[PDB]
């Protein structure tokens, strides 16, 4: 049903796009968190 296949694929891909915008924030924020503090208490030479 060309109309139904067109709409269904448009909707599911627009949603996957709106989610890329949220998946990439938490990756930036996890690296920022990695830079905020230096934890030398485990699995290190000193620890």
């Amino acid at each position: 049903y060309p109309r139904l296949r067109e709409e269904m694929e448009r909707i599911v891909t627009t949603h996957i796009r709106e989610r890329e915008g949220r998946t990439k924030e938490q990756v930036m924020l996890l690296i920022d968190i990695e830079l905020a503090y230096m934890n030398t208490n485990h699995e290190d030479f000193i620890g």
Binding site: P2, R10, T13, R17, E20, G21
Partner: protein, 289 residues
């Protein structure tokens, strides 16, 4: 009024950098003397393309629109010259065609690059291709048919490309080479739109009502009927406004098209292409935003 997708290009022009819409390429395909170059002319709204009976389009013309505050044209040859009179553009197109192809009806694959700046032209790219023929004439080698097809198969065989199949109304639809190519490269009818050009020349006692209603050869997106300026009028220098008024009178008057009047004409074709283009950005807007 300005449609929203045009208002976006105005806004991105105001920003001036680092943002733009991704639109498809538009290709117009048809048989010789079908009326393709009068379709591009009507669509753009400026009478700058060479037109008339016989072989005229001898090279691929890659017309590239650009949004700008002032109206003018330019070529990627003759660098730096700004053409504010489109008659000069038309003569330059003819001269550039002759410099490469020669004057004895030659055909060459090297494209002509033209760029037009204007207020509300999004960034749409249009391509004009040199018709299709069966029998060589003039200084044309025997295998010209395959070379012309090979030229077509470099544009219509790509995705992200709309196709307008142009076919005359006074020639039975079964003979159209436009539909044959569209069907071969787009079997599902996803991109193809059909244009019927010469509805005013139908032999007395016949019409194309059966084709305009998408019954005879069903095509997904239907058929749109247009009436352009005859050879006398283009030689008589009739203005586009008069041509549009005549087209509206014709469709409103013809008994077999009264009930289809609201789906026929150049402006409707513009609406159809605006909706078609608006629907190729829907899944990209979240990224822009």
């Amino acid at each position: 009024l300005i449609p929203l997708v045009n208002r976006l290009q105005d806004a991105f022009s105001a920003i001036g950098q680092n943002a733009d819409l991704d639109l498809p390429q538009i290709a117009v395909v048809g048989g010789q003397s079908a009326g393709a170059s009068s379709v591009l002319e009507n669509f753009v709204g400026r009478d700058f393309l060479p037109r008339g009976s016989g072989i005229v389009t001898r090279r691929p013309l890659v017309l590239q629109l650009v949004n700008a505050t002032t109206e003018y044209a330019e070529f990627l040859h003759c660098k730096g010259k700004k053409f504010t009179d489109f008659e000069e553009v038309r003569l330059e197109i003819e001269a550039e065609t002759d410099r490469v192809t020669g004057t004895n009806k030659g055909i060459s694959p090297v494209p002509i690059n033209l760029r037009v700046y204007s207020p509300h032209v999004l960034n749409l790219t249009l391509v004009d291709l040199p018709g299709m023929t069966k029998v060589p004439v003039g200084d044309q080698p025997p295998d010209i048919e395959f070379q012309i097809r090979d030229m077509l198969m470099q544009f219509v065989t790509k995705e992200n490309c709309l196709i307008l199949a142009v076919s005359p109304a006074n020639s039975d639809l079964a003979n159209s080479d436009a539909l044959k190519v569209a069907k071969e490269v787009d079997p599902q009818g996803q991109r193809t739109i059909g244009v019927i050009t010469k509805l005013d020349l139908m032999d007395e006692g016949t019409d194309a009502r059966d084709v305009l209603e998408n019954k005879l050869l069903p095509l997904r997106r239907g058929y749109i009927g247009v009436v352009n300026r005859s050879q006398k009028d283009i030689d008589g220098k009739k203005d586009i406004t008069a041509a549009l008024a005549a087209e509206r009178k014709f469709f409103l008057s013809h008994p077999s098209y009264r009930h289809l009047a609201d789906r026929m004409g150049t402006p409707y074709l513009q609406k159809v292409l605006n909706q078609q283009l608006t629907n190729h950005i829907r899944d990209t807007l979240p990224g822009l935003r």
